[PDB]
């Protein structure tokens, strides 16, 4: 029998700052214990200022970041070049994953970006269309090695102020572009450690005000 | 939804310094059977193209009616067909890429494995692959089926990554690649010793070698070897 | 056929005494001398390699033997009887130890299973 | 839903449903109306599969309702129950058939005389007495067979309606929340508010 | 899953969690599975989807036409049935849903539609929907009435969600409250589950099994 | 796999190709199939690789408690000793083994023994799953009493025919001859019988 | 998994990665695959781990038993012979997929065993999920009458085109050589090309972070005196 | 229908600087209904501490079984077992079920009492011994406890300093897995003491 | 069969268990006492397959009555559990495996304390202040861990536990036909004979 | 089945059998499999008969038409409107069609299409059942620009061996002769073929 999906691995990861957002991923796309290429561009600029990345299986990921841009691309002939805000952006996003409802886009898609505060903003996606507005979102293969890591040291869950045992909890100090980058950093070097999927190259996009920049850093090739 | 009848083995390839080679067995197998010993799986489209297809061969020659329609139709109406407005091995594989997805999404799917390797206008590189589900990825050297498994560790170890890509020679690419042929004919069970390899080069052009044949073999060794533990006769 | 000697050939007499362990005893003092020496920084066990014939070659009959890396034996009496010993000493130890501990026993332990080997010979049928 | 009866007597038709509700492990809900009244003297109560009970009793309700203005004239119950059969059988070789049983019971102004129609997903029309559908009729009919009388007043059918639910409430291993009782006659459709 | 809703003098009392998983992997404690229809029309989300945020945001949609066509408010009756109708026609294909549609008109009062992917459209006083619904039914059963006070009603809506946060694997992370009035929905805040317990569980003298 | 056993004027000659698949992959391409049983009563092994060497094991071992015994067994009862493993034990077994040797007074003699269990005493067997595309070449160009040339060409033309076809058989032809003189290993390599 | 064995000159060669998965997770990232069946004869498991440890240390054992008896070495081909007929009895069942080399009496030896009990010899063999990286370098570089140096260094490359190129395969490279004449020795970690980064952070906590309820000491100690 | 994860719960072991540390959450359930928040998965026979994870049924079978056997051990070792020795038993234990198996995740904790060294270990349910330097993770959220301790981990922490990194851990793995938490048991073992601490954590 | 509730409040413990015994699609007894004296102070009560349920519970009961004979001894609660847990663990691998689920309540006459235990088919055990088995946990656990309090008088219990039984009747589907209520003490085990 | 087509010299040879099965019952034993779509273009039949009758009435539906219109069609035509319908349905279709055809300009032209719906020019073709037990005998004895009468003999010795070990074909040899000269029917008996 023909089976329409299939699974090329990788991880993503999209971090909301104060004014700014950063959406992360590795560049190792594979099937089943081959490596398919050690340099695989994830991570997308959409443009007005939208990060996207859709996580899974590969051709559906393609194929639905090539939906959404052409769609901020008909958004501006139809509406005189107005900026699509990350929040509309995600909404049309849900409509392009559920108008495949009953044969889904098998992808975990993540964007980030802006909203029209000037905030940093991340929205997460299941293959259905289902979405929210999130802080902190880890996608893919070692979303489960990353996610509890990032409860700690984002959020400060279960963390609490010494000398008070457990009365007082850690409060919520705000991050900088620095100590974030630094967070994605060990999060995709201990996830390549113990998962073997995860690995090569990681590549963040940094949103701000002033545009889209681009990081990479090299990850163990094993 | 089908099944492979007539199917190609192996697709090997990998980019050098001014341009890129591809490689493929001349093998159409019928399950074990070795049928067909004639059949060419690389199609090269004008002189800056060349498109290797594994998987099967029916489907393969139905590709091969569409690119041969491609460049006919790319002619039409167009001055500048054979220069500024040629077909591009971007353009072709796109094309390609967006066939084997719709298909896949009809849940009818050309079965088949396609490394699409050339050179661009401006003569960079190209390399890029895609398959039966429309899944598509590019790296320095790759490889459908067996070639995956075997062909693509020894190719890695001539380029290894992007910065050893203007490092590696045409002979030295071309040894490489032949070496895995040799591998893959020791190794695959629906490979042939027969098969045609294709360079692409910026600037001496396509060059297409037909009726090559893997050599320098060993297997003197086999001599020694008896029985299959305690065996000494 | 079967083995219908399924009642103990060992029994204690009168007196109190089991013939067939004194009996045995008698077989052992008959046997060649053998000794053991603890010193401080180790153990020696030494004795007579009694050859029954000039022509043999009293190499290949090995009184001294290894149980495990760190445990040998030595004995007197009846040599055929030693040598099945040492055979199932040696295996009991794998068997009863260290395929369940990953390391060979220690020497009080395997001595425990020789002598359950010999207990069982002075009360089975 | 479970259970629905029925009973013809002398001068009316006597429709008895379970008021409950399952949805899964809870009860959702202990007081639901499983009936509709198709015009003023001809009701229907109704069980099966969820949803499609529901949306086809509204939608034959609402065809009846239609003919009623155009005509300015009442359907006889056997015209319904006929047009109600038509669309089960209709319904059953679908791309998805409704899952619905029926009774039908309604009052003929023209004859003077009570009717019970027993109509269940396949199409297939009875006329009866006394009627049921799913497991209420191996309980029920036994009692049903033994005590029932053509010439029975409203009151006694009443009374062996509540012998026949006590027998469910005894042996049935659901508990159906006790049931809604609704009487059609000469001067219409009413609801036996205690029982 | 735990949402529940229920009729009461006041108005509606809707409560719901916070968690959603895929598998015994905790994917979200933060979802939202009250759907604000519009100003004066609620929702909950049960299920396992996207199908009730999709339907919910298209239904409020929906009443929205209605009302720039009728020059009126939509009823809760009339909502309620636009999803029921809708979710029945993709009967089969595969829809999973489980919502209380609340609302409070001036023809109805304070009104709760149960509206089901099999097509079930149910009008009551008190809905529990989830995984962990029977445990919030418990709780609720034993101290229901209709002449609750909003801060009392308020309260017995977030100890229900919290008895099943409890209990239920699949149940938990925060309880979102709202309370539904005739001019509208008021938003009562979220409340951290973890935070919760310990605070109910001092002040109620509850959970004696548990260790604190 | 591509086995064949062929009489002959001075005796037997087992004939044998080296691939040994596992699905596509060829796990080992210098294989040796021929095994050997007994002095002058050799083996051709097709199927499942764990049984048919179990099986040969066990033959090696009853014809050599047989030789202790009784002195030197017959090529039948060596063939016989094969069958009663693989029909009793049919249900258990995917193995299919062409079973040849010498005596002086019989001569070379060739049994086959397919899935089923039965013993087919034949002039010259083939077998394996590269045997069905040579069934009509070895049919037409089999002679009784031939030379010990005329026979290894024989083998080497057949062989060199369901390896060209057979995907799951290649590598080298490996052939034993069985005579009065003794045994003898011949190897023949791809540059040799492709080219005829 | 990605094991290797190389014959050479006076003897053998084996190596293995260091990488133990549980599906797509690591768990262990310095494994260590080459067992000792006795001093001189080693192997390299692939498969199911537990039944790869079991199966050589019960074969292992009988052999050492065995040679205790004969009073002599113990010889490859008998381990290969109670390996096989151990697990074609079992059929399959125990997902043993073995290389075994070693030196004997006879000589120096180098064979594979595949669970349902078949084996094969050769100059050159690899086995597991990184078998077809490993042997594309093995059919690339081996040739007859290879020294000491050149197996070890042949056996390494084919290790690590299954740690770079197979994802079942990663970490270390372990290797033990065995020379005629000659002690085994076990090269444990022989490469180390995967050492992990310095991390960007320290993630010590500072103490009284975590919440407590309740403190107490336990007693490990015995039944006390007095 | 799983039985590994029937039931739940999570374990973890750490080693530091001349001590060790094994923790473990509370949770046993019937897949969606929690059931009991004081079952401990952490026991001990004299100085060797075991951790079981999996079927609640043979986590008590096995802890029973190990008391079982220690006990003999001593009686006829005339000494406490040493968590190497153990580590084997418990291998050798499991891998006599190796066609019809115990469902659980067993992690072996201790120090030896004659070299003073720290030692952890871990099994799959057929007895393969996973003997790690840094830490051990087993459970229905060992994913999570993976991810968890790769980050936090670092070599050679002083015991007070270990209990934060164990406990934060479990707390923040546990948090996210459906079928653990319920409680928490953190155990710092050293030479000659052992410390038991209980945690507080969300009751969901 | 279908419910049966324990709690162990100040000085006793108390077991609740259905009457209901169905059999397919009838409710052949409405008072089916599931429960065995196990000793004078211990009592189990038990829901499961059919037939299973009865022939371990009269085997465990043997069992434990031979043992009080043979050492002129009453086990402890802890150690009859124990006992059982054992049973159903050895149970569990065997070729049929006892398909039963138990409670057992009981009075340690040592200790002076109430002890419910709670075992299911797989030789799960644990202790608990109270517990149930099959889908009665889910409907009363909550109730229980809002009002239950370990100094509660049996009083106090029996009216928690009428509120359990309540809720169960109000939001089940199955008719269980109430509950037959025991109470285990320092004085024995005695039955509440109006519930 | 058991079919082949030959090119030679003057032009082409078709040849079959003519067992049809239903099971291990023989519905037909005088099956003519040798079926005409053009005067000088007709083709071997295998697979499911009526699928195979269905595509060739159709095929010579087709080159009728294009007759009609633009004179004469190649065999390369003939061959691509039978690849056109074996392709396009192949999911409903079990045909295996061995075209084979005469043009001056051309001369003898050989095209196989099996199950998957491709077109192989090849100089000569088997195909069928029975096909497999002779690609041994037939590479070994094909040869290119044979006379009329070494093609007939290399078919009638080809399909002899086929037969003789097919159960699925038998019965007799028909052939079809296609040169400049005009159409040959030819049929050879199992008295004749047996004994070769
Ligand atoms: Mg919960
Ligand atoms: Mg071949
Ligand atoms: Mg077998």
Known sequence: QFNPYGDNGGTILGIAGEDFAVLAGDTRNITDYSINSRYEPKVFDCGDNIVMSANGFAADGDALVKRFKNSVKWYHFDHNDKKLSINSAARNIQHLLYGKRFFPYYVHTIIAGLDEDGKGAVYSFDPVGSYEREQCRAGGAAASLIMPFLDNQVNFKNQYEPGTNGKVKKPLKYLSVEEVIKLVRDSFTSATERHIQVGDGLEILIVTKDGVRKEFYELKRD | ?233 | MTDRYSFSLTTFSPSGKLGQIDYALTAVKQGVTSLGIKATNGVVIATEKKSSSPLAMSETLSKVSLLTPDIGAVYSGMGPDYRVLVDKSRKVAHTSYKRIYGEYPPTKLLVSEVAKIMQEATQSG | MDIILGIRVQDSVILASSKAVTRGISVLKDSDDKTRQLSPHTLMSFAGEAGDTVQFAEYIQANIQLYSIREDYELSPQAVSSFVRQELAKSIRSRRPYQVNVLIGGYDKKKNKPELYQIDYLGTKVELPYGAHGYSGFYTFSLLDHHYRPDMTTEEGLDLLKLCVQELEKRMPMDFKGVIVKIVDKDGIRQVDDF | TTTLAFRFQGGIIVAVDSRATAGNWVASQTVKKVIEINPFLLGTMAGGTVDCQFWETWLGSQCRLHELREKERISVAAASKILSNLVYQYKGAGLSMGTMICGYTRKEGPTIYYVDSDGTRLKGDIFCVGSGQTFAYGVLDSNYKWDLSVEDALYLGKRSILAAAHRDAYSGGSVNLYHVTEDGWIYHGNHDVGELFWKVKEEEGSFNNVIG | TSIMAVTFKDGVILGADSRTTTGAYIANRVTDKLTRVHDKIWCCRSGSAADTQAIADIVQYHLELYTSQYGTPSTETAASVFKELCYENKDNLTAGIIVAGYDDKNKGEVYTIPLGGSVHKLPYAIAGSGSTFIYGYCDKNFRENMSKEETVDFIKHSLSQAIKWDGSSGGVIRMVVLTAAGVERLIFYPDEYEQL | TTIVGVKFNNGVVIAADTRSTQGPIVADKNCAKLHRISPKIWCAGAGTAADTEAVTQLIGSNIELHSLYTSREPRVVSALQMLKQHLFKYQGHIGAYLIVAGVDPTGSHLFSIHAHGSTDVGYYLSLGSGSLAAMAVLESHWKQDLTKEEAIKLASDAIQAGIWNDLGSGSNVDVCVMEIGKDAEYLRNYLTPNVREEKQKSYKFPRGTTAVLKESIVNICDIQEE | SDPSSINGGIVVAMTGKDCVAIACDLRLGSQSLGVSNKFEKIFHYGHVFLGITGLATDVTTLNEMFRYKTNLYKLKEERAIEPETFTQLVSSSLYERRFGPYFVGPVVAGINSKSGKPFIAGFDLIGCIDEAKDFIVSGTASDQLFGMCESLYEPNLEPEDLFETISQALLNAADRDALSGWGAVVYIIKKDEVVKRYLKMRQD
């Open chain 2, 1 to 233: 939804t089908q099944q492979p009848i007539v199917t190609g083995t192996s697709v090997i390839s990998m980019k050098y310094d001014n341009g890129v080679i591809i490689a493929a067995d001349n093998l159409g197998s019928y399950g074990s059977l070795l049928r067909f010993n004639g059949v060419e799986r690389l199609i090269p489209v004008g002189d800056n193209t060349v498109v290797g297809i594994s998987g099967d061969i029916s489907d393969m020659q139905h590709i091969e009616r569409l690119l041969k329609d491609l460049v006919t139709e790319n002619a039409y109406d167009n001055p500048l067909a054979d220069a500024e407005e040629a077909l591009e091995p971007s353009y072709i594989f796109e094309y390609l890429a967006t066939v084997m997805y719709q298909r896949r999404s009809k849940m009818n799917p050309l079965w088949n494995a396609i490394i699409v390797a050339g050179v661009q206008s401006n003569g960079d590189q190209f390399l890029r692959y895609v398959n039966l589900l429309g899944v598509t990825y590019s790296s320095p050297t790759l490889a459908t089926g067996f070639g995956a498994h075997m062909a693509n560790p020894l190719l890695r170890k001539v380029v290894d990554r992007e910065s050893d890509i203007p490092k590696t020679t045409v002979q030295v690419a071309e040894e490489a690649i032949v070496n895995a042929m040799r591998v893959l004919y020791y190794r695959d069970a629906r490979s042939s010793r027969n098969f045609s390899l294709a360079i692409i080069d910026k600037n001496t052009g396509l060059t297409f070698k037909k009726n090559l044949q893997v050599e320098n073999m060993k297997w003197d060794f086999a001599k020694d070897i008896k029985g299959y533990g305690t065996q000494k006769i």
